[PDB]
Every structure is written in structure tokens, then in C-alpha cells.
Amino acid sequence: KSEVAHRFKDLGEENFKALVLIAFAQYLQQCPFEDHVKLVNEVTEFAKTCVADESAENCDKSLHTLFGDKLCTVAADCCAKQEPERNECFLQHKDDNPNLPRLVRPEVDVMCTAFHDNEETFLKKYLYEIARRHPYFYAPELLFFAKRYKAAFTECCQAADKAACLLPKLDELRDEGKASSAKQRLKCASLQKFGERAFKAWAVARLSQRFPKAEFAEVSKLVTDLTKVHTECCHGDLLECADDRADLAKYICENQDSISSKLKECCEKPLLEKSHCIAEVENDEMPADLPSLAADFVESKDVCKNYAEAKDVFLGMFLYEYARRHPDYSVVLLLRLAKTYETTLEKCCAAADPHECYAKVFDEFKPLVEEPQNLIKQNCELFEQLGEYKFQNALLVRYTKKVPQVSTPTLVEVSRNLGKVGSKCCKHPEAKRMPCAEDYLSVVLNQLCVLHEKTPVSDRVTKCCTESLVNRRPCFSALEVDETYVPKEFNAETFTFHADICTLSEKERQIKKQTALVELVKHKPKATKEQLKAVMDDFAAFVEKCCKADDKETCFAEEGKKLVAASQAALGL
Template identity: 35%
Template sequence: MKQLKLTGFIFFLFFLTESLTLSTKPQDVDDSSNIQKFIEENTGSLTIIAFAQYVQEATIDEMEMLVKDMKAYKDRCLANQTLPECSEIANNVLQEMICALEGVPQKHNFSHCCSKVDFERRLCFLYNKKANVEFLPPFPTLDPEEKCQAYKNNRESFLNHYMYEVARRNPFVFAPALLIVAARFEEVAKICCEEEQKANCFRTKAAPITQYLKALSSYQKTVCGAYLKFGLKVLNSINIAVFSKKFPQIEFKELTSLLEDVSAMYDGCCEGDVVRCIRGQNQVMNHICSKQDSISSKIEGCCEKKIPEREDCIINSKKDDRPKDLSLREAKFTDSENVCQERDTDPDNFFAEFIYEYSRRHQDLSTPELLRIGRVYEDLLGDCCNRENPPDCYRHAEDKFNETTEKSLKMVQQECQLFQNLGKDGLKYHYFIKLTKIAPQLSTEELMSLGNEMVTALTTCCTLSEEFACVDNLADLVLGELCGINENRTINPAVDHCCKANFAFRRPCFEALKADKMYVPPPVSQDSSTFHADWCQAQNEELQKKKIRFLVNLVKLKPELTNEDLKTLFINFTVAVEKCCKEQEPEVCFNEEGPEIGN
């Protein structure tokens, strides 16, 4: 997958998430039997995904026991749907069975969830998920020949193991996306197992799947975090902005109707209810294709395809052009004498329509920026409508909007200038130091991941014509990763404030953060200044990770040092590594140089 194509894909993630793999044609969109049949046929896969995401420490043996129980439940209900247990919500049944696994709740520390019921239990399982998966062993890697033999010997077992490992490491990715990832991985296995250069084939063809999964995970965590922390209004605002930009011809009434399906989808998907998520995502796709004439002029061919080709086609289609008769300003929100009265009649609908109108007129803006402008307008009317002459006040709203966009644009320009001045490696060191200083409580691995994602955003976007929207969108996803989904996640007071105070303005909030003054560094241990000869065996990517890990830990130990001092220490360290690795006895050299570097 080319970088530019991946960037376009991530842009569109602000429009739509992955849908269900079904062989469904447009004329079948109202036939629920297709989706029901799919769920029944994939009971095992859906059980694996749900269990691995809810109880990430669970073993494969425990997973297989649960799959067996769920399949037996399915068979009982297919034989007799009048049984009382068959009218239960699927996710409740699943969690009940997880709790019934002998010794498992106690072993994996989720018995407190099993003592709750219904919504409280579902919420407990959700918040039991851990985004930071350092506690899991490294992703198991097989020799390509072993991998292909395992696939040929038992396809189902091979794919179940793969799905289990991917799901437990991506606990917030929606179930339909993981099913697609597994299907795409199987296609790779089929092709590569017939090749002579199997290792190279797997490495090349699996890379786009990994990128795809990372992009989905980041987006879905960000939107679910917004929904769970800020509620339905913010979720709807996000979706209004992205749909209006993608489909500027859609009527507001049609958009509000579509939003009902989209909101219902997120309600199930964000909770981790795999069955409700699948039904919800399928409903969204059906809605779009059944109303394509009023939604977009560019998806007719897409909707004639089967899923997943249908969705891939829509994702890769260009956004519609802004209608020629659509001016850059909608006068009703700034020039009308009755703005305050219209706002007071139905505030939620009024501001939703404002975001819709502004978004379809400014397709070049990022989704976070459109939300900022919506918030600026809301605050402006809060002030203006309390004045003696409101129209004189809100008539200058466009100036406020332009001012907000100028501030955001300047922030992006400064970030891209850093890239131009420092280069990719220098940019990495800048963000590893910056992020560690503002959130030193995060684990080293988390900080490394966030820094790499921010650098990827800038190196991907800063050379594009759509630089502003690209950087602002992707940088916001990095903050979504940092803030997480759990509303009770706590890092430090300053970071928590930026994560929880105002979703639209968290980017400017984070940009203004300084080093956490309340942070108390851990005591310096002997290990922190001890280096071993294994550094000399590390090559390329592994060596780079070791260096970055050292830098992040250095900042954690010495947060009071300036960025320049930290960079100097880091440079001295890399020079020492190169020097020692050239010696006949690197260990002796490291013992001599280590204390000098660490102090």
C-alpha cells in the first residue's frame, strides 16, 4: 500500500469504519436473514474476538472451552428458540459464560465484573480492557515453512490462533475489522505459501494489513473515547463533520436520519458487543447504498459491488465536489435577525445544522478544526444572545472562525517546520523528549509508540497539498491514543485536564503543556547506567529501539534537564556505544563509559 494511499485511507476513517464481510447485494439490504446467517456461521470467530478482547490474559485452552460452550448454546437455540436463555442479549450470554468458566475469573482478576449484572457488568468488562499490552508476550512468530505447514494441516485452528493473538493485542478494534484482517491474512498465507521466498513474501504482503489495523485501531479508540467521555453530542458532531465533508450534497434531514444508524452502531461497537456491532455496521452500509442518489453521485458503482468490495470502493472514492450554488457562507447563522430565537427553539439541532453547513462548505478543513469552529460559534452565541443587540455581536462570527483556523494552521506550520529543520531522526528525539516530559507517568513503551505515531503523522503529511487537514487529523488520533477510552484513566492533572475538558480543543491544550512539575523521578539504580555487549549485537530497527528506550528513560530520570542537555547526553551515549562496540572487550568499555553517560 503506497503511503499516499494509506494517508487517504486514514482521512476517510474520519468518515467511516470497516463494515461486515457479507455477500450481500443492494436488493438484499433489507433482508436480515443474511446478517443472521453470517453471525450463526461465525459464532466461533466472534466468541474468540470478544473473549480475547475482554480477557486479554486468557489462554488458548480457555478460549477453546468458551468457543465450545457458545457453539453448544447456538445449537440449542437453533433447535428451540423458545428457550428462555435464547431471548437474552448475546453479549450478556457471552459474559455469563466467561464468568462461568471454572477458576478463570479469579485467575485473571475480573471476578469483580462477574458480581455485577446487565449494563454494569458490560461496562466493567469494557473498562477491564488494557490498551497497553506490554504484559503480553511478544507476538508469536513462526518460521514461514512452519507457518505454512500449520495452515495446511488445520486451516481453522491456524486462523483462530491468529485471530486470538491479534484481538488480545487490539482490544478496542471493532469485531468486523478483525474479521477482515483475518480474511486478508489468510489471502496472504495462500499466496506466500506457494512462493519460494516465503519470508520476504509474508513481510511485504503483511505490512499493509498491519498499517490498516493500526489506522483502524487508532481511529476507533479516538471516537469511542470521545463518545464514552463526552457523550452522544460530541459523537454526532464528529460524524456530522466527516459525512458533510465527504458528501456535501447530502441534505441535512437525510444526514440526521443516517446519524441514527451511525450512533447505534457506535453504541454497540464501543461497548465491545460483537453481535450488535456487526448488525450496526451492516445497517450503516445498507443505509448509504439504499439512499445513494441523495447521498453521493460517486458511489453508484460501489453499491453494485458485493461487500467488502462495496466498502473498499466507497472508501477509495473521491469526496464529492462542493455544489456550485453553495456559497462559502450560510447567511442564516450570521446575518439573520432571528439567530438567537432559532437556537433557543432546538439548540442541539441548530448547532448540528451549523456544523453540517460549515463542513460541506469547507472540505479542506480537518475534522477537529470543524469541531473547534462549532464550539467557538456556540460560545459566541452564548455571549451575543445575552446582549442588548445580538445581531451586531454575531455578525462578526466569520472573523472568529477565521481567527480560530489561523491559530490551528500556525500550529501545523510550526510542526512541519520542525520536520524540515530537524529531519526525521531529529523530529523523533524532539517528540520523545516532549511527550516524556509532559506525561512521564506513561510506560516507556507507550511513550515510544506515541512519539513514533506523531513523527509518522508529520513525515506523511508535511509534503502533501492537504498538509493542514492531514496533520491535524492524524495528530488528533495520537492524542486519542494518549487519552484512551476509559473515562477514569489518570496520567497527571495537566494531561487529564486536556483529555477531559474540551474534546475539540485538546490539540491546542496539549500544545501549551510544559513539563510535569509534580513528577518525582524514580531513584537512579545501577541498572540505569549499566550497558552490556548485547547492544553490539542489535541491528538496524532493534538498535534504534534500544536507543529510543534509553532516551525516554533518560528523560524520566532527569526531567529537570533542558532539551539541549538531554540531546547532548544522548549524543554522547550513541558515540560511546559505537566506540565500545569496536573494542575487543565491549563489556569492559561499557563499564567504564556507562557511569559517565548516566550521570
């Protein structure tokens, strides 16, 4: 009868209340904390009337009806529309890059005091600020981040040196939050732009790598249940997402013998810890001496009959069989092989002799496997030579030349994120490097696709982003220097810095230099790597020299003019 009562009962007042706060923050990102807290309290007092009496008026209503009505008391176009169009309108208006105050943390003393004086308000502000900045944040994991954010303050505010305890933990959580957010953003883009089949294929590959001793039918069941969880979360159905996620963790832990040997310690833990643990669990050991796929998938004359019975189940079995054997392959690689196999059956199963045209399909896989292997090898060697910062600069120039229509702040941000692949993957042995590197790259290029989507100025970004989810990385890699781009005019201010540059962090100084490098390339897209290296070396040299001087403002002014002069000397006005 009452859905609001059902969810309230299933999750309990605390997680119900946290999940409604997250929903409202993700839908109305510009709305004040105080206003959301009130809407949550009102809905929550209502839900309890529905728990106590299921036939109580408006307890029969859908969650979307109840939640949109409350949101609409404070909201715009979307409040004129009715369900289901209203919810769709809200989803459509989620802002990936909200124009919001850049959030600064006070002294540790201030923070610890606030935590003691107003614990509940302090933890609710955390949920609110994270959710409005990251409107696709996986709501159940955000409950876990909040739990760990609380443990950080509880421990570190007792400590002898608080700042020493607390700051490295807020930095780990902040960094892991951005990783969790980027990953969830890609799951939602898959569902919303490429459909449930795209996500199901991703899930079959990933779960098959993790749970290789699981039977295909077990893996299919988990894929069904996991697909339902992410469909609900990405559609703003947060109460049912968290509910259904808690149910999947329960199922998995009660069937460890059908799934994995690695779950025992995860399935001891409390609900939020357990769900997180299962999600990040290590790949099980492969069943020993699994046979070659050739017999049932390329040499059998029954391939098309088997395809005909159930296209998606047969392609599922192929993906499962391939993925469980290759923990050492990227999930996008496995999806590229299955998609190749599929296009091969679509052509070949219509032939008088299907076996003759599909017999060499495994030959088609060799170059598909080698291309990522050679990309990682090649970029890890550059990484080892250059180091992170200079590796980022190399990728900056590369991508500014591919897609020079893209905004400077977007090129700098995406290129810095691209360059972090080096540190996060190149240290791994070559049996872990491909999934580390290439699935991370898929997450970062999705960031490019979503930052560019609202005002899609680069046709080649749009093509690479829309043509094929699974081909995105190769598509970007293959992009040539854009010969059609008309160079932009150069503002002299690009190379004109001020004294306070000396007061910024190493990271901010690099971003200033990376910003200038992009503005150079956009002005002189034919400029050599050697010519750009000279200019950038002079830049570094000028900032070090000027930050040492007594008259810093003077030094920067003069050296700016020198650099512009030298620049124009080497590459032109």
C-alpha cells in the same frame, strides 16, 4: 422472540462464530485460546437449537444474559453482579495494555505448514490474539483483516519465494491493524467518556466533508445509523454492531444518488470489502460556488429563533455547512468552530439585541484556523531538517518537559507516534495537510490519555484529556515546561549498555537511546536542547564505536563511565 437466533440468521454461522470469539477475547483477555473456542462452540450449538425452534427454552434471553453466563463458567467481581451491571463491569475491566507474551512469528515454512495443516485453527488464533491485545478493535473490520490475512497465506505459500511474498503483506496488515485499532479506540473514548452528542458531532463533520453534495437530512440519517453502529460495538454488542453495519452499507449502496459519486466501485464488492471500501472512500467533489455562511448564521436576525426551534439541528446545519466547504480543515478544527459558534449563541441569544453580540463571531474563527496551520507548517519544517528519528527526539524532550510524571515507556511510545506525523502528512499539499496531521495527532494523544487513565499521576494530562475532547491537541500544545516537577534520581545503568545491543534492530537501538534521553530530562529538566544534543551525539558515537570493537562488553563499560563523567561535567551529578 429469539435475539440469538435473529443474529445467527442475519450474519450466518461463520461471521456469528468469529464475532462471539472476538467478544469473549475482548472481555477475558488473559483466558486461553482453547477455553474461548469451547465457549463459542457451546453458544453456537445453542443458537442453532434457537434457530430451529424460537420457543425452545432460554432462546428468549438477551445476548448479554447468554454471553455473560458462558463467560462466568470460566471467570470475577463481575460474575457476582447481574445484568445490566455485569456487562458494565466487564466493559470497565477491558485492559488497554494487557501484560501478555510479546507475540513472535515463526519461520515462513513453519507458518505456511500450520496454515495448510490447521487452516481454521490458524485463522481463529489470529482473531483471538488481535482481539485480546486490542479489546476495542472494531469487530466487523477485524473480520476483514482475517479475510486478508487468509488471502496472504493462500497466495504466498504457493509462491517460489514464500518469505518475499508473505512478510511484506503481514507487515502492511500489522501496521494497518494498529492504525484501525487506535482510530476505533478514540471513537469508543468519545462515546463512553463524552457521550453520543460528541460522536454525532464528529460524524456530522466527517460525513459532510466526504459527502458534500448530500442534503443535510441524508447526512443526519447516516450520522444516526453510524452512531448506533459504534455505540453497539463500543458497548460489546458485537453481533448487532456487525448486523447494523451490513445494513448501513446496504442502505448507502442503494442510495448512491443521494450520497456520493465515488461509491460505484465500492458497492460492487463482497460485504466485508464493500463496508471497508465505503468507510475509506475519497471525499466527493463539492457542489460548485456554494454561498458564504455569514448570511444565515451571523447577519440574519433569525439566528436565535432558529436556534430555539431545535438547538442540535441548527448547530448540526452550521457544522454540515462549514464541513462540506472545508475538506482542507481537520475534523477537530470544524468541531472547535461549531463549539465556538454554540458558546456564542448561548451568551448572545439571552441579550436584548442578540445580533449585536454574535455579529463578529467569524472574527473569532480566524485565530482558531491559523493556530493549527502554523503548528503543522512549523513542525513539518523541523521534520524536513531533522528526519523522523531526530524529529521524535525533539518531541520526546518537549513532552517529557510538559508532563514529566508520565511513565518513560509511555513518553517514548507516544512521542515516537507523535513523530510519525512528519512522514505520513508533511509530503501532502497544504490542502490535505491539516486533516492528515491534526486528526492523526488526536488519535495519538487519545493513546496517551488511555495509557495514563488507570494511574493518573500527571494532573495536566488528566485536565487536557477530560476538559474537552476537541481541545485536546491545543491543550497539550499550550502546556509549558513543568516548573513544579522535583527531578528524579539518575541510575548509572541508563548509559551502561551490553554487547547484545549490537544484535538489535535499528528501531530497538533508537528506543534504547530514546529511553535514556527521557531518563536524562527527568533528572535535569532545565537541560538545554544544545546540552541534550551533545550528550545524545556522544551516545550515538559510543554505540557505533563499541559495536565495531573485538571486546564489546569492555568497550561499553568504559565508555558508559566516560559518558556519565562527561554528562555530570556538562549538567552535574
